[PDB]
Amino acid sequence: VRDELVWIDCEMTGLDLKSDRLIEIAVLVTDADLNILGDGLDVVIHADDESLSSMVDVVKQMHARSGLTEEVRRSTVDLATAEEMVLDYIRGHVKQAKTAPLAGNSIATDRGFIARDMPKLDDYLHYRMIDVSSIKELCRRWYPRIYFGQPEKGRALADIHESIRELKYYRATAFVPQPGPSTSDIAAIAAEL
Amino acid sequence: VRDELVWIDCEMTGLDLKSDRLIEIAVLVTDADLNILGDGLDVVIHADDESLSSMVDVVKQMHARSGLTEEVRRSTVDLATAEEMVLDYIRGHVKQAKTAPLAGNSIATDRGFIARDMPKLDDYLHYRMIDVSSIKELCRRWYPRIYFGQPEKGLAHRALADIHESIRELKYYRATAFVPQPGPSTSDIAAIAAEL
Ligand SMILES: [K+]
Ligand SMILES: [K+]
């Protein structure tokens, strides 16, 4: 029951939903214990030269240096095809609609582009998301040693792998050992709240 | 200084960023220990009858029953004024831009409307957010007893009451799913990081 997390990372020409284009999407599925269930999928999505010419210089330099911009010019994959490839990959692991949450770092940004451009993928995923950066920001306040001790971080598919490693790290440090507290302790705490 | 969490909940005519209107916004600031730093602020934002008439029946019924729809009709507050009232409230507690994260349940939805309609508020908050529902969904898998033991929610469907429920939910997870402070040793943390 509920043994899949869908990990997605996107790259864009920028973060403005009124004008920027989605140019890369990667997907990996894990079980609930963060074991990777397959090799996943990453797709570079075509954007025309006019769209790419709108990138601010910091993003232009980043996408030039990673080789993404040249891959975008050479891509023959449109939005609808990328959506079908990602959703078919997910449906191989996730059997029910509106069950699997989207997981990643600052995943709301990626979900904004998916909602705009990939409505079928948006509708298939649970509306709830697992933002690893939510846990990062809580540890930053509650457990500074955990925040400063994060494993070192190194394109969509590599970013996903690092998000999974960061959550594994928080599970092992910030979260209680299974099975967690007693049913009576839980009841007492809930009662006060 | 990283104490402060900014808690915001919005109400809308619907969740479609192409057409729906933001009709209520509430804000509370907490310290890092989730103590409320003031009484906060909630503002009903005017929308015209044409916009309100586009609400699907389940949303129409929710906003009718809470009194929100009638408060919207009577409101003289526009988006720019609501944004200024919320941002002035936050700036009383949060001294630096791009420092305080936005906190709530499924807070991405609210942030989407804030980014569209309130660019100054959007820019003042950290881009990072604390989604209490992220913790809920992790506990649902890792600690079913914690997930099923959550405190009962009032379900006011009004911005300020919803914020209070989000804070109580995070207090509940902090007391159950998270290790007692100060947590594991620097050496234990290093050993775990090394394996990953
Ligand atoms: K990215
Ligand atoms: K709400």
Author numbering:
A (entry chain A): 1 to 154, 158 to 196
B (entry chain B): 1 to 196
Article excerpt on this structure:
Orns are highly conserved DnaQ-fold 3′-5' exoribonucleases with a DEDDh active site motif that degrade short 2- to 5-mer oligoribonucleotides in 3′-5' direction and release monoribonucleotides as reaction products.
The structure of Ms_orn in apo form was determined to 1.87 Å resolution to a final Rwork of 17.9% and Rfree of 22.2%. There are four molecules of Ms_orn in one asymmetric unit with two homodimers packed in a side-to-side orientation. Although the terminal residues 197 to 209 of Ms_orn lacked any discernible density, a significant part of the unique C-terminal tail of Ms_orn (residues 181–196) could be built and formed the additional helix, α10, through residues 186 to 195. The C-terminal helix hence provides additional interactions for dimer formation by burying an additional ∼1000 Å2 surface area in Ms_orn. The catalytic Asp9, Glu11, Asp110, and Asp162 along with the general base His157, which are characteristic of DEDDh family of exoribonucleases, are conserved in the active site of Ms_orn, as expected. The carboxylate side chains in the active site of Orns usually coordinate two divalent metal ions for substrate binding and catalysis. In the apo form of Ms_orn, we observed only one monovalent cation, K+ ion, that was coordinated by Asp9 and Glu11 in all the chains.
